[PDB]
Amino acid sequence: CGVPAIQPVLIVNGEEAVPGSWPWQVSLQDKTGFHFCGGSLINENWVVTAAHCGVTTSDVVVAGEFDQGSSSEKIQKLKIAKVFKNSKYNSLTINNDITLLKLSTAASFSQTVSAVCLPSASDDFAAGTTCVTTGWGLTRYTPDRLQQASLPLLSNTNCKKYWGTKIKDAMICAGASGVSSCMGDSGGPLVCKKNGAWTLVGIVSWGSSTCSTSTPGVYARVTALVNWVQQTLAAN
């Protein structure tokens, strides 16, 4: 996991990514083909996304896509068998914002489709560390081509200076650096390189209503949720 066959070369104020360089990135589209959320492949049969994305079994998971306006890309449209919304998810506070999607049809891994790594519950990602987030969300307050942006992680204590008590333990902040995740990026990945491999540290969750690049974005903290992910995959 976490090692793209096509190496990446380094959302408001982001940049266009190298085609296929973020192989675990998927697009969640409704039956009309409308992109509404991002997601990350963790293996051939499961996708991790945000619980607030409100995915249903009528929605479709699209893997291997780069330019949503192109008809010549060999993409994979995968049906969803079951939606596992974390029972700890609190829609009022948006805490524990994670949902697992069990695919009815397994994804076919290739040079452009593969899995991201999950961290250990005890893994530490220090404030100041520069990570990357990707998605097809608005670039100005959606773009056809996949965007990317590097941004720093903040500590929860420092994040509270911005969001106060809205910041919970199962959340992690990043940004306030000139870039920002925005509507349509939700459910997508916030990855950091650890020991040579890209690890899923956060899931785009919420933030500034205007996608302000001076305010930090809030992501679901994967280290606080990985135990649930492990339990779910094991029992299903």
UniProtKB/Swiss-Prot annotation:
One of its GO terms (cellular component) is serine protease inhibitor complex. It catalyses: Preferential cleavage: Tyr-|-Xaa, Trp-|-Xaa, Phe-|-Xaa, Leu-|-Xaa. It is an enzyme of class 3 (hydrolase). It is found in: Secreted, Extracellular space. One of its GO terms (molecular function) is serine-type endopeptidase activity. Disulfide bonds join C1-C117, C37-C53, C131-C192, C159-C173, C182-C211. Belongs to the peptidase S1 family. This is Chymotrypsinogen A. It comes from Bos taurus. The lineage of its organism: Eukaryota, Metazoa, Chordata, Craniata, Vertebrata.
